[PDB]
Design an enzyme around this catalytic site. Structure first.
Site, PDB file in Angstrom:
ATOM      1  CB  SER A  90      -0.861   0.383   1.060  1.00 43.21           C
ATOM      2  OG  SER A  90      -2.070   1.103   1.120  1.00 43.21           O
ATOM      3  CG  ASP A 187      -6.812  -1.963  -4.012  1.00 40.10           C
ATOM      4  OD1 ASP A 187      -8.087  -1.696  -3.044  1.00 40.10           O
ATOM      5  OD2 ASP A 187      -5.769  -3.289  -3.947  1.00 40.10           O
ATOM      6  CG  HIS A 217      -5.792  -2.168  -0.002  1.00 38.90           C
ATOM      7  ND1 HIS A 217      -4.854  -2.120  -1.269  1.00 38.90           N
ATOM      8  CD2 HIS A 217      -5.027  -1.418   0.998  1.00 38.90           C
ATOM      9  CE1 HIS A 217      -4.254  -0.978  -1.011  1.00 38.90           C
ATOM     10  NE2 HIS A 217      -4.213  -0.532   0.751  1.00 38.90           N
TER      11      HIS A 217
END
Ligand SMILES: [Ca+2]
Ligand SMILES: [Ca+2]
Ligand SMILES: [Ca+2]
Ligand SMILES: [Ca+2]
Length: 243
Positions: A90, A187, A217
Site C-alpha cells: 500500500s 481492490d 487490498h
C-alpha cells in the site's frame, strides 16, 4: 499488546518490508516468515505513530514515515546486510519506489501501491474505521468512542498523505531497478489501475506484473497470500545477488 518491528535473520540476501498507512508490522509478518523459510533475511520497521493510539498519527507526518523507511534500510546495512530488496504494501509500496531512488536496492516489490493522492472515499473512511476499532481495542465504551470520534480531525493528515502520494507518482519515471508489481484485481481501497501505471512508467529494464483475482487490498494477509509469497520468491531468486 501492539506490534513491534521484527528482524528475521537468515542468509545474506535481505528484504526490507514496508507496511501501509494505519498498518504495522503484523501486515507483513507472514511474508517475513515465508522469506525466512526460503533463506532470506527480512526487517520490517514501523512508521512513527503506528501501532499506537491513532492520535499519534495525527501528530506525525508522511515525511517522517518515509525517513522511518530509510532508517530501516540503514539498519539492515548497519546489521551487516548490504544487498537489499525493498518490498512495500500500500503506502509502503510507494515508499519502496521512492526508497529505491534514495538507496541502492537489488529490486523492488510493490503490493497494491496507489498512484495518485485521492484520499476521498475509501481511504478517508478506512482511516476513521481504523481509529474506531483502536478505541474499541482500548476497552472504551461506545459513548467515549463516539464523543472522541467527533473530535478526531483527519484532514491535515490526509492532505499530507495526498501530497506525498502525488510527489511519488511524479518520481516513478526515475525508478531503474528490477521490479515486481503486485495488485489485487478487486481492490476496494485504491484504484487497481495504479499497478498498470507503475508497470508502464518505471524505467526499469526488468519488470513483471501479477494480478490476483480473489484478494482484497491487504494482499499479504488475504486468501491468496501463499501465491503472492511464491511469486515474490521467484522474483527474488531472479536478481543479481553476489551470493
Ligand atoms: Ca546484529
Ligand atoms: Ca518525473
Ligand atoms: Ca527504458
Ligand atoms: Ca523479472
Amino acid at each position: 499488546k501492539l506490534p513491534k518491528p521484527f528482524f528475521f535473520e537468515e542468509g545474506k540476501r535481505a528484504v526490507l518490508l514496508l507496511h501501509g498507512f494505519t498498518g504495522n508490522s503484523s501486515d507483513v509478518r507472514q511474508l517475513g516468515r515465508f522469506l525466512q523459510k526460503k533463506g532470506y533475511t527480512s526487517y520490517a520497521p514501523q512508521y512513527e505513530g503506528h501501532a499506537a493510539p491513532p492520535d499519534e498519527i495525527l501528530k506525525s507526518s508522511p515525511f517522517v514515515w518515509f525517513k522511518d523507511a530509510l532508517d530501516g534500510y540503514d539498519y539492515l546495512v548497519e546489521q551487516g546486510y548490504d544487498e537489499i530488496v525493498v518490498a512495500g504494501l500500500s503506502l509502503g509500496g510507494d515508499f519502496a519506489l521512492k526508497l529505491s531512488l534514495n538507496r541502492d536496492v537489488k529490486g523492488i516489490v510493490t503490493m497494491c501501491a496507489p498512484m495518485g493522492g485521492k484520499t476521498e472515499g475509501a481511504i478517508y473512511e478506512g482511516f476513521l474505521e481504523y481509529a474506531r476499532n483502536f478505541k474499541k481495542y482500548e476497552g472504551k465504551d461506545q459513548e467515549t468512542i463516539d464523543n472522541e470520534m467527533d473530535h478526531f480531525k483527519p484532514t491535515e493528515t490526509l492532505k499530507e498523505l495526498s501530497e506525498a502520494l502525488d510527489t511519488i507518482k511524479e518520481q516513478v519515471d526515475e525508478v531503474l531497478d528490477p521490479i515486481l508489481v503486485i495488485q489485487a484485481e478487486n481492490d476496494n481501497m485504491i484504484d487497481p489501475q495504479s499497478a498498470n501505471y507503475i508497470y508502464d512508467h518505471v524505467d526499469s529494464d526488468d519488470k513483471n506484473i501479477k494480478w490476483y483475482s480473489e484478494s482484497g487490498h491487504v494482499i499479504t494477509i488475504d486468501k491468496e497470500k501463499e501465491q503472492v509469497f511464491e511469486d515474490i520468491y521467484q522474483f527474488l531468486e531472479s536478481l543479481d545477488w553476489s551470493e
